Amino acid sequence: VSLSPLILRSLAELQDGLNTVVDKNWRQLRRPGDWSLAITMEAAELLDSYPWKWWKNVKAQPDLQNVKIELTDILHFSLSGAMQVSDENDLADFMFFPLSDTNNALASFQNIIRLASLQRFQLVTSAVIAAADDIGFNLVAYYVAKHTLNGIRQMKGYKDGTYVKVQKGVEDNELLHGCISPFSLDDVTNEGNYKTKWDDIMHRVYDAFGTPKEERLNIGHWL
Amino acid sequence: VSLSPLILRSLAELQDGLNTVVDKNWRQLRRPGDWSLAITMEAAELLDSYPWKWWKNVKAQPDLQNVKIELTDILHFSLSGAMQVSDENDLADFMFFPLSDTNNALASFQNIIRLASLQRFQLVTSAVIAAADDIGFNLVAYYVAKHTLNGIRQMKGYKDGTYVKVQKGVEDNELLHGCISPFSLDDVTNEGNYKTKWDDIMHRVYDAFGTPKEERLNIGHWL
Ligand SMILES: O=c1ccn([C@H]2C[C@H](O)[C@@H](COP(=O)(O)NP(=O)(O)O)O2)c(=O)[nH]1
Ligand SMILES: O=c1ccn([C@H]2C[C@H](O)[C@@H](COP(=O)(O)NP(=O)(O)O)O2)c(=O)[nH]1
Ligand SMILES: [Ca+2]
Ligand SMILES: [Ca+2]
Ligand SMILES: [Ca+2]
Ligand SMILES: [Ca+2]
């Protein structure tokens, strides 16, 4: 399972743009080990979406909507890693389907950590794409939506430590589900029209956070 | 750097006792992969004690007192793993001193994750002992104190999901520092008298959480 090369290239361009918002010279400041750490930490967040602890709240239920967000976060970091180092610098060995089985999920997502530490970023990207295919969620649409939230966060003091993620019982991430649900897989991968659908996802996320029109960045900013 | 074999054996006995409080048949219910996951997750907590994120709160300061707690948590899980499988089933390659350097810490603590996934539990234990020696904190006293909090947690609904860790701005873990500060390294490792000092640490932690005298377990319960 893979995305069209043109779609992947566009996702990579968005990722470079976002990385540039965080730091103009990110390509000189960041190293492969940074992306390995970042993926490791998101993978811990992904694992913590499951009731894996045998000693604490043992009847807890998995947060399967959150799984989607954490996989999307991993993609941002695996795209980033791949921009800096090639894998040169197999999947069915590390991923176990169906991921609806919690034991399969825990094993697979721990293996993402192994792959990250090996700096196999392209393989991590493939693993996330395969996971979204297996779980049956719209990875590309989640990416565009979380990409947009990531930019909003930077606009609202994230680097300064003044941003608050959970407000009035709602985490910013949770608002993304509703922003994406109108969009099909074909909407966001159509060769001719995908960019207008990505632009539409972006506008929906800006709306969800009340971003003033003048501060909004459209799809053209990123490509 | 290592502990006396008699001290290590006593720490292992405490650990078995605690594991038994969580489940009477833990030795049949738990598998090596459980302990690998648990250490991985504590190592993420340890890494998150440092200002590693380049995109969020970039001027944050490391929580060096919390580092002590997270290393102690790793020890509980590495002791546990070692009870189930041997390493048969080197350190200077994986740990980088001094750990006061944040780059050394991030590299080292990520390598603890690699060792956990390899089920090298004894090596993880050695790494924690070496880390406490390098940082200069009283690992054995931290272990006894956190061991006691772990038992209190189980008494107060931890498995049921009714426990609250942070109350009136104070995390339960933070109260342990004051419980241990009177105790020297020699106090808690003295061949003849260490058990009375461990018992004293326990009584201090029970006091810190107001545990009724009848619910308190003394050192003899565990050895
Ligand atoms: O140079 C960077 C730094 C961060 N991120 C994004 C990717 C990921 O989607 C998000 C993770 O941010 P976080 O601060 O860990 N918060 P959360 O996991 O709740 O989204 O940050 C980037 O895309 N590039
Ligand atoms: O079978 C078990 C399960 C847990 N723990 C202990 C070890 C560790 O000290 C603690 C971690 O608990 P947690 O629920 O992750 N909470 P925190 O990391 O804040 O202490 O649980 C055990 O000793 N044995
Ligand atoms: Ca995160
Ligand atoms: Ca996340
Ligand atoms: Ca923990
Ligand atoms: Ca911990």
Nearest protein Cα to ligand 2, atom 17: B73
B contact residues 164-223, partner A, Cβ 8 Å cutoff: none
Q: How far apart are CA B207 and CA B190, in angstroms?
A: 24
Of how many residues is chain B composed? 223
Question: A interface mutation test: which of B18, B45, B48, B56 has the most A CBs within 10 A?
Answer: B56
Tell me the CA distances in angstroms from B59 to A12, A34, A152, A161, B70, one per residue in order. 28, 17, 20, 8, 22
Residue given tokens 């009340």 in the structure block: A210
Rounded CA-CA distance B27/A213 in Å is 60
In order of start, what are the domains of chain A with their CATH numbers?
A: 1-223 (1.10.4010.10)
User: How many Cα atoms occupy the beta-carbon half-sphere of A153 within 13 Å?
Assistant: 21
Contact (Cβ atoms closer than 8 angstroms) between residue B144 and residue B203: no
Chain centroid offset of residue A153 CA = 15
Tokens 């490792």 label which residue?
B189
Report the alpha-carbon distance of residue B18 to residue B187 in Å, rounded. 23
List the 75-104 stretch of B: residues with Cβ below 8 A of A: none
B218 in Cβ contact with B199 (< 8 Å): yes
Query: Which of A42, A66, A170 should be mutated for ligand 1, with most atoms under 8 A from CB?
Result: A42
Question: What is the stated resolution of the deposited model, in angstroms?
Answer: 1.8
What Rg, from alpha-carbon coordinates, does chain B have?
17
Which of B55, B60, B117 is opposite residue A22, by nearest beta carbon? Answer: B55
In angstroms, the separation between the Cα of residue B45 and the nearest Cα of chain A is: 9
Prior bond of A212 cis (ω within 30°): no
Q: How far is CA A221 from CA A14, A21, A146, A191, B126, in A?
A: 9, 11, 16, 19, 52
Experimental method: X-ray
